[model samples]
Target: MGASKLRAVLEKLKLSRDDISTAAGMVKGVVDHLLLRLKCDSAFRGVGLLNTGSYYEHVKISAPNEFDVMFKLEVPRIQLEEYSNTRAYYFVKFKRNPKENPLSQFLEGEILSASKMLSKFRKIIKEEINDIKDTDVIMRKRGGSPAVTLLISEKISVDITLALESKSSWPASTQEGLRIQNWLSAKVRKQLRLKPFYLVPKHAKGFQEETWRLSFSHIEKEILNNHGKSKTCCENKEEKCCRKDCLKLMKYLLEQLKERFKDKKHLDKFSSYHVKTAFFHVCTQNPQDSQWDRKDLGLCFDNCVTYFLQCLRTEKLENYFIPEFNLFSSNLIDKRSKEFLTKQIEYERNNEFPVFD
Candidate 1:
């Protein structure tokens, strides 16, 4: 039977669940490394693989089930002109050792390397800032620091976990979240494709809370500020903030998302009734608390960070972290981030359980 026919056999075998994801990860990592190292057309020439937005349907991968091998062939545009075949298929498989997981080991090493890379990035920035004698200097000004280093670190860890899980469940579950790119990188690339690429300025740094903030073009920061605004500021000027209504609004948002992402699939390219169920939980779980007041962009941002921690299953004292809102300065850290982080750390110390629920 051909590679396309192998799907039937895979569905019948129902292999063990452990090795599947590892197999998937190995395929993607190897492919990505090769693509970058060779400076392939897709990597530099901008051919072969299409942009992230080109994929209207996402592949959804399920958990590991003994076997996972990803397909990485690209549909080069030249094929349309040169080839007569309607579709292309490629296949390669290797037996699992059942003794050790090489995929998992590789992923752990990647995480360590990523951490080191982040540390280096921070060290370079600090050195540059310290070298600046003039306090008014924009790039290396005295007391200047990147606004979202910690945020990036937190997200990196999450991204690593997500990749780990994707590889672990590869052949069985091909979720889109794993296939194209991580949420941040994909968003950045999407934006860069639209505009020109600039080496992120040494002095300018303010985009960790949201992916959209990081990917804007010339007016990126201004566009981000405007996005934080909602035309509906409320009828009464003196009206107090309404959190209950916020929860209800979030509930409605979830319903809208349910409709939108219900048919969505992950990396493995499968769909099901539960797909929406998963999306429902992951997509809109924290908006109510994090964005109770849309007027105060800073407060909403702080809450957005806290909500992320909560999604990571951090929990403490029956409350998630939500920093206080400031009227005068929107750039100050909201109390929410601090509150959630403090509670989570404390909970872990006392209970030996994660605080991000």
Candidate 2:
């Protein structure tokens, strides 16, 4: 009965091609318009769009209303100054920009001003995007989120984050994380490092606007897309496993519970990333494809939930990339709230995930 219920949830999690087509049209329309207009502004030149987060990751379980699209600025020969001991935040300063470049206006001595650039970026969207054909946009701010959410047609929502792309080496902040050598191979890790890292306009605790938080979202997307213990593990229907299905189910479970408990203040900070981090750690624990058999969707999801409960009990769910940081820090989630959320998750698991209904 439990397994059957889990299968039903997975069926709901699957998006029809029509759903994808509609969202893709909206995404393409807005992105093309932004690029067309933004290309005219010299300061926003070379701006490229990167589709990120759950939408592109194919793990989205909601109504496909929310999207994460990044506008990346290329910055070569840049220096990174860690704002805090965690090394997850940095000050990006160009070594040289040849004769007062367009971006030079947003510089703070040597540091690139994240606040200034975001202000102008949002300003451009708020003013210019209002004129885009057959659509409406409210460049929204949700409690200091780095992304400015655009509610398109008041139905589809696109979360836009402006980021700087740097060719610099990965920061020491990573501290031996991405422990996927046994799963994705060390060779893959080396190649991934060669790809550039991104710094979003988000700031850290006790930091100023110039400080930008590091984002390995590009790497995350690559890993998820290519996710398999052996690359060919998911290459054919004969060897498919329900790993992504399990994640989507978990994501949906959290979404339902959060909505159910909307008035419950203690669980507000508990987010999908917490569920995702828990899933990745569990994936590492059971790296073998055989361990995540297609028939074992319910079992894999149970393992994921059990592991998340363990993290809450220990209050030690580290950021998958940055090993030193605790996602369950007292600042974000306190001990009492952690315990409360844990009990709630346990209730859902023990009850065969009624929230997923």
Candidate 3:
């Protein structure tokens, strides 16, 4: 397709301002009620809520109903025991006497029980939602997922996730991954790194309390919000770039493909996080204003898709924050899926991306 046509397609895919505002309002309602309820509760006194995910990143499209809001609670100095081969997952427990904190009750020996905490959180959310008579919000629990989902409307849903903020140092695996130092100055990178990391109430089979997943939703939102390499990259001082546009298209393409291949077993492993990580790597590789000019949206989008396709084919899409966490792990996506994705991407590239239509 021609440049104008492609731009028009992308523009059409963009969420309207009204849609964004409505979604934000819904999210605020959910967050406000939860915070008020948890504030008086001693166990989660200092807990805070923050918006994350696609809409918060300004890359949301099609619909703005889906949102991710994290309820972050500050934990006292705690000892984290690494779980299995993953760098992000860890078993956490208090370092000092358990009586000092209210959370100590959930401790199963030296390990915290994610299941127990999540159950309590779910109950709290359910009761709080029941107290609100104005809204039609209902809780929907997904098995194995850490998020406590709230269905605000038939079309709108929010994933209310419980997380713990840790002041401890980042894991050794992430030491070399964030390559934005060259693009965005070392000061910004360092400041972000110094910020406390978060752990979600997520765990696996044997290591329930020991396997809380490391969350980078906050960092990801920050980076995407101020996404330019230079200070003036996307500011009023300079012209706009197609970097976010490229990412939006990549996300859209992946979403469409997943829906199209929903029946296929091999495609189940692919997620939006993989596409997001690929976008970060692409930015680091081509960290220049001129490279992603607004006028070059078509070419930029193509380049982004091509890079993602290459990653899929090679099965080496590394997580941007945690390098050791490969998004396309061997056990997750086999050779068959990669081959299928390669051919589908090629077809979509050759055709005018019919999926977007």
Runs in model 3 lying further than 4 Å from the true structure: 51-60, 134-145, 205-210
Model 2 regions more than 4 Å off: 15-17, 51-60, 97-101, 140-145
Global lDDT for candidate 3?
Answer: 0.76
Q: For residues 1-357, what per-residue lDDT tens digits would candidate 3 score against the true structure?
A: 466766776777763655678677776877788878987787788878654333233333555677666788988787777778787678888887877877877877777877777777777878888776544445533432445667775666777778888888887777987878876768889989998888886654324444687777778878887888767777863569988878778888877888888988656767778888999999888888788898888888888888988897788988898888887877657888888988998999898888877
Q: Where does candidate 3 clash, by residue pair?
A: 90-210, 91-210
As for candidate 2, its clashing pairs are none
What TM-score, over all chains together, does every model reach?
A: 0.19, 0.93, 0.91
Kindly give the stretch of ten consecutive residues in candidate 1 with the minimal lDDT sum: 156-165
Give the candidate number with the greatest lDDT: 2
Worst 10 residues of 3 by lDDT: 51-60
Better of 1 and 3 by lDDT: 3
